[PDB]
Amino acid sequence: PGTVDKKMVEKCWKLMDKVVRLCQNPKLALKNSPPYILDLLPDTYQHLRTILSRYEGKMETLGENEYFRVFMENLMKKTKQTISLFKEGKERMYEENSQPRRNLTKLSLIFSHMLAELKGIFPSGLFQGDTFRITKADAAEFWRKAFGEKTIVPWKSFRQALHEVHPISSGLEAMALKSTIDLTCNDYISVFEFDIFTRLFQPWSSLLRNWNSLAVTHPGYMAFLTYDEVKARLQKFIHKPGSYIFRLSCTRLGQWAIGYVTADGNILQTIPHNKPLFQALIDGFREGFYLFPDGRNQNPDLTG
């Protein structure tokens, strides 16, 4: 990624401005709920405006920062990709179940993850990536030993370092892992993305066994799904109480959100607290709430 100057941030602002205008089309019927692209892009502009204001007179420091160069490169690519999506999708952007519309929804999630990462690394406009707090002690020790105080590393470097502690059994498994951990879809792993993954799939001691049981082989897990998509996907199971799915919370990154059909005709979503996802799923099955993952009659046996 090349050096980021003030002109490059202004070019991204223009591209984001085009995406905002595309997403103001009333044919989209865009719901004002996270992730909401019409909030995320102006909020990203404002945080970049904040970053630039903290680096007045020291723009050479900001331009050389590796994380910020990777971030701006990804921001330009993602906005260009959204513009191309509208250009090629044409009228299919407004059909609610179309693939081009689903691609826009996934991109909206990516913009939300990117803003969350940017605020985690530049909390008040100043770079603090070297002192980021990985929330699980064992995961923090892994990153420190493998990468010191780095904020971002290429996927290849990350896979190699992880494999030495948690062996990855195959190339296909490594691609599934990458797709899970790389929330910003930039082929890099930030310390912020690593924290999120290791909080979601704790304990560290059995990290990849947990991820395999909760995501790789579990029909209830939904990658890159939003609150509104979970409610929509459960509608077909409104008469099948106990149908449930789960996914990453968008607004509380690092925590799980479980959606389920109640016995009284409601579709509710909850964020487990003070217990790991596996125990929430086990207790929920025993108590009758989480019986049918994605509406399927067989539920995985996690008591093992």
């Binding site: 389920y260 509710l268 607290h273």
Partner: peptide
């Protein structure tokens, strides 16, 4: 989001 069932 609502409390856990």
């Amino acid at each position: 989001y609502t409390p856990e069932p």
